[PDB]
Design an enzyme around this catalytic site. Sequence first.
Site, PDB file in Angstrom:
ATOM      1  CG  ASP A 130      -1.341  13.934   4.036  1.00 18.26           C
ATOM      2  OD1 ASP A 130      -1.866  13.005   3.789  1.00 18.26           O
ATOM      3  OD2 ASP A 130      -0.855  14.993   3.409  1.00 18.26           O
ATOM      4  N   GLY A 169      -0.999   1.526  -3.970  1.00 22.11           N
ATOM      5  CA  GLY A 169      -1.557   0.748  -3.426  1.00 22.11           C
ATOM      6  C   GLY A 169      -3.201   0.199  -4.114  1.00 22.11           C
ATOM      7  N   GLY A 201       2.350   4.016  -1.086  1.00 26.59           N
ATOM      8  CA  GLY A 201       2.359   4.614  -2.316  1.00 26.59           C
ATOM      9  C   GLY A 201       1.336   4.178  -3.482  1.00 26.59           C
ATOM     10  CE1 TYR A 244      -2.932  -3.288   1.043  1.00 32.12           C
ATOM     11  CE2 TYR A 244      -4.214  -1.773  -0.056  1.00 32.12           C
ATOM     12  CZ  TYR A 244      -3.786  -2.919   0.367  1.00 32.12           C
ATOM     13  OH  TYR A 244      -4.899  -4.055   0.046  1.00 32.12           O
ATOM     14  CG  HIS A 271      -2.189   7.971   3.997  1.00 29.97           C
ATOM     15  ND1 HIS A 271      -1.639   8.201   2.877  1.00 29.97           N
ATOM     16  CD2 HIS A 271      -2.110   9.136   4.735  1.00 29.97           C
ATOM     17  CE1 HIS A 271      -1.435   9.574   2.575  1.00 29.97           C
ATOM     18  NE2 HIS A 271      -1.773   9.943   3.867  1.00 29.97           N
ATOM     19  CG  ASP A 272      -3.743   3.812   0.165  1.00 26.92           C
ATOM     20  OD1 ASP A 272      -2.854   4.792   0.198  1.00 26.92           O
ATOM     21  OD2 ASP A 272      -3.098   2.962  -0.426  1.00 26.92           O
ATOM     22  CE1 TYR A 294      -0.861  19.505   5.527  1.00 25.70           C
ATOM     23  CE2 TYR A 294      -1.814  18.495   3.592  1.00 25.70           C
ATOM     24  CZ  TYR A 294      -1.033  18.477   4.593  1.00 25.70           C
ATOM     25  OH  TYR A 294      -0.250  17.150   4.546  1.00 25.70           O
ATOM     26  CE1 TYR A 341      -4.650  11.866   2.009  1.00 25.20           C
ATOM     27  CE2 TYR A 341      -3.832  10.865  -0.106  1.00 25.20           C
ATOM     28  CZ  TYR A 341      -3.528  11.719   0.934  1.00 25.20           C
ATOM     29  OH  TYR A 341      -2.354  12.493   1.327  1.00 25.20           O
TER      30      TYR A 341
HETATM   31  C1  IBP Z   1       5.769  10.991  -4.323  1.00 26.46           C
HETATM   32  C2  IBP Z   1       5.502  10.586  -5.516  1.00 26.46           C
HETATM   33  C3  IBP Z   1       6.099   9.280  -6.423  1.00 26.46           C
HETATM   34  C4  IBP Z   1       4.022  10.622  -6.053  1.00 26.46           C
HETATM   35  C5  IBP Z   1       3.207   9.487  -5.899  1.00 26.46           C
HETATM   36  C6  IBP Z   1       3.027   8.212  -5.545  1.00 26.46           C
HETATM   37  C7  IBP Z   1       2.150   7.356  -5.570  1.00 26.46           C
HETATM   38  C8  IBP Z   1       0.883   7.834  -5.817  1.00 26.46           C
HETATM   39  C9  IBP Z   1      -0.462   7.075  -5.901  1.00 26.46           C
HETATM   40  C10 IBP Z   1      -0.943   6.832  -7.116  1.00 26.46           C
HETATM   41  C11 IBP Z   1      -1.501   7.500  -5.035  1.00 26.46           C
HETATM   42  O1  IBP Z   1      -1.386   8.396  -4.151  1.00 26.46           O
HETATM   43  O2  IBP Z   1      -2.522   6.728  -4.873  1.00 26.46           O
HETATM   44  C12 IBP Z   1       0.686   9.173  -6.099  1.00 26.46           C
HETATM   45  C13 IBP Z   1       1.816  10.085  -6.001  1.00 26.46           C
END
Ligand code: IBP
Length: 121
Positions: free
Chosen positions: A89, A31, A29, A27, A47-48, A64, A51
């Site tokens: 965050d 995920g 990044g 996850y 975190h996902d 922000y 969001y």
């Molecule tokens: C830090 C940079 C590499 C941005 C980055 C990384 C992962 C994601 C995924 C698509 C998400 O946030 O869901 C978005 C943006």
Amino acid sequence: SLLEFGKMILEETGKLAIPSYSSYGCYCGWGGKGTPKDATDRCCFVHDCCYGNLPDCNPKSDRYKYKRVNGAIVCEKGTSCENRICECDKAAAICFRQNLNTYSKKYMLYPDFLCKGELKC
Ligand SMILES: CC(C)Cc1ccc([C@H](C)C(=O)O)cc1
């Protein structure tokens, strides 16, 4: 936005978001599925999910403001999406700091096929 998120992570952990937390586990990044591999990956999953609770906000580009009051992260007042994104965050960054001791390099660049499963928010 990502900008703020990345800087919070560095301040908190002394690690750069890319690439310590942008290709970690299932996850962090990028995920979408499977069982999170460890405590850090679970921070990313929650975190996902966080969001995921704001359909009509844009957590990646909406910016922000926050400040440090001694070590504490304090989200400053913006629009309602901004306030809520910042709370998501802020929590991920504390979660990262709290599990820094089990952070494992074995999970960086983790392959997609090993992320499998089903885990509901
Ligand atoms: C830090 C940079 C590499 C941005 C980055 C990384 C992962 C994601 C995924 C698509 C998400 O946030 O869901 C978005 C943006």
